Design a protein around this nucleic acid. Structure first.
Lengths: 153, 259, 118, 204
RNA sequence: UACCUGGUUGAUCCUGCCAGUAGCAUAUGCUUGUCUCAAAGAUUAAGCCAUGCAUGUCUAAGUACGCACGGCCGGUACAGUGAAACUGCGAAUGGCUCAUUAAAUCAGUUAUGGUUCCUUUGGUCGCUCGCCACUUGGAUAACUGUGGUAAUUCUAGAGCUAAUACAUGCCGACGGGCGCUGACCCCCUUCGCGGGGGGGAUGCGUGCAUUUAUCAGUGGUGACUCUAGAUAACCUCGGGCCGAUCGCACGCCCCCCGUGGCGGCGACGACCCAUUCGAACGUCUGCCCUAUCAACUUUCGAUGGUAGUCGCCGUGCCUACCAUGGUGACCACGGGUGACGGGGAAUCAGGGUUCGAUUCCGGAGAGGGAGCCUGAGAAACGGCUACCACAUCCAAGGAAG
RNA sequence: GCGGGGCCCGAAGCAUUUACUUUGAAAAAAUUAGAGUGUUCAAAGCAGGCCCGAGCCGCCUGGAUACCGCAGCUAGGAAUA
């Protein structure tokens, strides 16, 4: 249950952490601010992304990713592969040769921001797009609305 | 291929320049300038297809090398300079003073002006920014910049600057009920007041435009050019008056005027 | 194939003469052309070798240590006229430039003057 | 001639791909610089756009930052003690953008006693007389002794940091990009983070 | 024009198909008077080419000492025009063809807030406090002159010759302001007392840009680790800026004095900001035939996380350490394509069907692969070198493609 | 949005999201459909038209208009699924 798991000290760049501990600043009271910004078209910043204790360079609220462009929607199908979930967005293509439709899909991998507790199998997830994060990962998780739950035995 | 282009084929040049299909294979290919290569109309075909003071391309050089062409008061000697929007030419040999604004049919209209209203231009602002050492700047619809501006001028205001001096002259803030001209798209060349600047977070803003004759059309915001408080233009105003006539509305005024 | 400063190969090798080494006038900017060259070590494989005498020896070689052709393409910069003449300062340097009498047979005699720089 | 674009990767499904064109100039060759410690040797390469980047072949000094008291001066570079990325680089003394490098403290020592009036880098006594005691005495007046003695409440530092000030050198962190820009800048380790990197040096 | 007729039979009615018909597009036969617009070595062979050419270029205004032209209009700076050469810009555009190439290119659509951008313009161009400045230095080419070569747009030595080439480099503005420090202020609570200030002598530094880290919340955007300002320093010698430039019509006050002070229009140079050209790259959607191609990728980066490495910038783009994942019968992977993609063309009741190599835009390649210099722009072939294959001149030495 | 007045009408919540439809933007010219025009007619073309009284600084005018699928952006409609 620790944050320093990598071999280098993972830290937000902008907040300045080494500031003037003298005997006026007593060591029985320890606190730091946690950097977060707000993007733009009306999304909340969820609770555990502000007072949370994690760290990321690629979370859209507390990393250097400035997310802009399209906003798309999907269904979670595969939640392996650390900090990265695979969502299978699924559409209905139209062919005018038969005047009838055709089921098609191509799944897509998005960056799981670590401020979320339950992101399970089969969840409707809204997702915006940003700069390229990896070779497959471009997009980014914003907000999980309820699915596969609200009541689990 | 390995670098940028310096030719232009004929049919790639826009259809409102009205070039002959058979005179040759190439286009003007205007220079790099303040007005981009699709919107603008170069100085060359304006004299040899529009004004028809010339015959060839050689004729246009040997008036323009002798330094009597004054685009916006500045003596220009190249043949394919990009002229653009809110432009004033000045022959200053026998008093021409044209002004090139889009007509009611989507083309550049040869429009004469008195030599006293030919003393300025209007510039839609598109980016202001606080420059270094605590001063602000801006930039115009074309590639002009202005230091120390009047800070009521906010984004997509239209300012005025006067030639041969260069300072700010007039400003008019973007607001509803105020007259403008759309300078691009499917509705360019038709002129009307602004119902509202309807907004979009993220995406393009598209505004609702009401003319002087009750038509209600719309273009997106990056073509709106304000020249009017209430409804008064600060500029000379052509025939057509920024009102586009339908195919029945044209044919009765075209076949009652060749009588 | 000419001899080149610092090859030290008694033989004939091929180097890549860029713009400015020796023995190759390049024909456009950045053009490197590899041409064969001969090394700086002397041999009897030489049809001719240049030579520069740096000291008088014995006598008057006929036409070689006498008959100084007078330098006609003289100073034009205003520090080559201001290197030879020991003109101090405020001397009106323009009057004192090197000149040339002109002697075509077909025309009349002239004296011709350079421009000036700096 | 080393490429950098996509067409020598495998695509997303895991299937091979065939490149349709020769590799262009804008996938410029990428030689490793290996910034190491000595005197100063700096080489340049003209790039696209005509700009010049100073890639740093060998260095001596840097322009490190103390930050918390806003003290940025030069100091010279001694040794490289840790590097988190590649464990090869620390046994061969190469400087990269995030290598925990060890530097002397004596340019920060002569700033600290010049401003705060504390003993620092001195530990036993009876040797500090010639110009080493007068860095705080100077025959100060009333208004001078008032402003410096109220700075005593803003002049404590945690004991695991000045313990190596007494012993001589500080380990700092590079933040510039040597081999790309041409310096070895950076901040100085302190706080809970200095508790971290000394622990990982301890455990290697 | 939402169209059918001749054949299985001794006949009839069918399912069926053949043939006929009418296009439009290649070849070819026969034939041919006039006149107007006129496709054309793509189909096989992205096969090889003898030759001759298709890219250079002076403005009054970067350098004239060619006597090569000037009436040397005269006791000396140049009446200028000028051949060549140095420099600056191009030669990366056109043009040719379709071999590659099956989510590739490409078509939209949407970004670059993840970045560079010659020219054109529009702004910045005494913001810096520091003994040649009425101008500092060394060559080099054209040329006088000796040549070697069997030979090529082969070039060596020697003489000197300029600069907007190459370097260097300050005067003046510039008087100082500003925060930092600190022997003197005593006029105040000195009354055992302690004060609260202004004044400073001193010694540092003062810009644009680069780089590190820090405070703070003019102008900001659905949105910032935005821009702007303050604090503390650096400032790469194969080293960023603050004009040692060239003309044109001449003038102002001339008062230290017949000597120095001052002015116009230009022409180029000019780090940076923005535009303009654009290029790169990311997002979403869209492609032919095949299962006699059903599982594919992962030592060797396959997918993701850290942390760097160079890179114009995003990132397995590499590397190291980790994670054991990814794609699939909604057809992946593999192969075939006589597939460049598109705007289109023919066809036409409507649905479609087939072609589009080709003149417009986008991509690829200059015999086959690969590697680079110079340039704002190249993995350039009317640039270079290596290999492969084909191929020339030759006096056998080497040249040229 | 003319510290609590009234003729006030928004920033917004979009309270299961989509599928479907409707309108509006943006959709390079050429070409096809097409509007004007005795190229002598026509394929074509983008030009042409009208009077010397020498005023004839020569006047008027054309060079229109749709079709640009699918997928995204928009404000609606909420039967059907």
């Amino acid at each position: 249950a620790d944050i320093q798991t990598e071999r280098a000290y993972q830290k937000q760049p902008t907040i300045f952490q080494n500031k003037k501990r003298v005997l006026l600043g007593e060591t029985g009271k320890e606190k730091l601010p946690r950097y977060y910004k707000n993007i733009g078209l009306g999304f909340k910043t969820p609770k555990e992304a502000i007072e949370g204790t994690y760290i990321d360079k690629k979370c859209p609220f507390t990393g250097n990713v400035s997310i802009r462009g399209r906003i798309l929607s999907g269904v979670v199908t595969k939640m392996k592969m650390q900090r990265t979930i695979v969502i299978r967005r699924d559409y209905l293509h139209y062919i005018r040769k038969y005047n009838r439709f055709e089921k098609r899909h191509k799944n897509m991998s998005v960056h799981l921001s670590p401020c979320f507790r339950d992101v399970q199998i089969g969840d409707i997830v809204t997702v915006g797009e940003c700069r390229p994060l990896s070779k497959t990962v471009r997009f980014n998780v914003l907000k999980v609305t309820k699915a596969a739950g609200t009541k689990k035995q | 291929a390995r670098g940028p282009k310096k030719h232009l084929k004929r049919v790639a040049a826009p259809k409102h320049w009205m070039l002959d299909k058979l005179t040759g294979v190439f286009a003007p290919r205007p220079s790099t300038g303040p007005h981009k290569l699709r919107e603008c109309l170069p100085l060359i075909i304006f004299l040899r297809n529009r004004l028809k003071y010339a015959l060839t391309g050689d004729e246009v050089k040997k008036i323009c090398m002798q330094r009597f062409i004054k685009i916006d008061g500045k003596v220009r000697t190249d043949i394919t300079y990009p002229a653009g929007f809110m432009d004033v030419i000045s022959i200053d040999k026998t008093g021409e003073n044209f002004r090139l604004i889009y007509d009611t049919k989507g083309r550049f209209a040869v429009h004469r002006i008195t030599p006293e209203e030919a003393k300025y231009k209007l510039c839609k602002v598109r980016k202001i920014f606080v420059g270094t050492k605590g001063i602000p700047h801006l930039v115009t619809h074309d590639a002009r910049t202005i230091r120390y501006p009047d800070p009521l001028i906010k984004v997509n205001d239209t300012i005025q600057i006067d030639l041969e001096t260069g300072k700010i002259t007039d400003f008019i803030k973007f607001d509803t009920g105020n007259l403008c001209m759309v300078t691009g798209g499917a509705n360019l060349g038709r002129i009307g007041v602004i119902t509202n600047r309807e907004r979009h977070p993220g995406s393009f803003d598209v505004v609702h435009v009401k003319d002087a004759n009750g038509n209600s059309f719309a273009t997106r915001l990056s073509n709106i050019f304000v020249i009017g408080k209430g409804n008064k233009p600060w500029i000379s105003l052509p025939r057509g008056k920024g009102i586009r006539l339908t195919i029945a509305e044209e044919r009765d005024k075209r076949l009652a005027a060749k009588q | 194939f000419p001899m080149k400063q610092g090859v030290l190969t008694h033989g004939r090798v091929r180097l890549l003469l860029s713009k400015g080494h020796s023995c190759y006038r390049p024909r456009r900017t950045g053009e490197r052309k590899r041409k064969s060259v001969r090394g700086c070590i002397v041999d009897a494989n030489l049809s001719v070798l240049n030579l520069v005498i740096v000291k008088k020896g014995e006598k008057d070689i006929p036409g070689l240590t006498d008959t100084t052709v007078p330098r006609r393409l003289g100073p034009k910069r205003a520090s080559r006229i201001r290197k030879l003449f020991n003109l101090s300062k405020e001397d009106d340097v323009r009057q004192y430039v090197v000149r040339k009498p002109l002697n075509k047979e077909g025309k009349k005699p002239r004296t011709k003057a350079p421009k000036i720089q700096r | 001639g080393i490429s950098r674009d996509n067409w020598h990767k495998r695509r997303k499904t895991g299937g091979k791909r065939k490149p349709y064109h020769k590799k262009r100039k804008y996938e410029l060759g990428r030689p490793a610089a290996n910034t190491k410690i000595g005197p100063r040797r700096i080489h340049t390469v003209r790039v696209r756009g005509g700009n010049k980047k100073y890639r740093a072949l060998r260095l001596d000094v840097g322009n490190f930052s103390w930050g918390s008291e806003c003290c940025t001066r030069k100091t010279r570079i001694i040794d490289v003690v840790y590097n988190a990325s590649n464990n090869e680089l620390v046994r061969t003394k190469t400087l990269v953008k995030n290598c925990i490098v060890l530097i002397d403290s004596t340019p920060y020592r002569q700033w600290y006693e010049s401003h705060y009036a504390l003993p620092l880098g001195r530990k036993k006594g009876a040797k500090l007389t010639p110009e080493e005691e007068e860095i705080l005495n100077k025959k100060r007046s009333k208004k001078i002794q008032k402003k410096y003695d109220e700075r005593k409440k803003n002049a404590k530092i945690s004991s695991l940091l000045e313990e190596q000030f007494q012993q001589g050198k500080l380990l700092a962190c590079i933040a510039s990009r040597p081999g790309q820009c041409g310096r070895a800048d950076g901040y100085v380790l302190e706080g809970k983070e200095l508790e971290f990197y000394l622990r990982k040096i301890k455990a290697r």
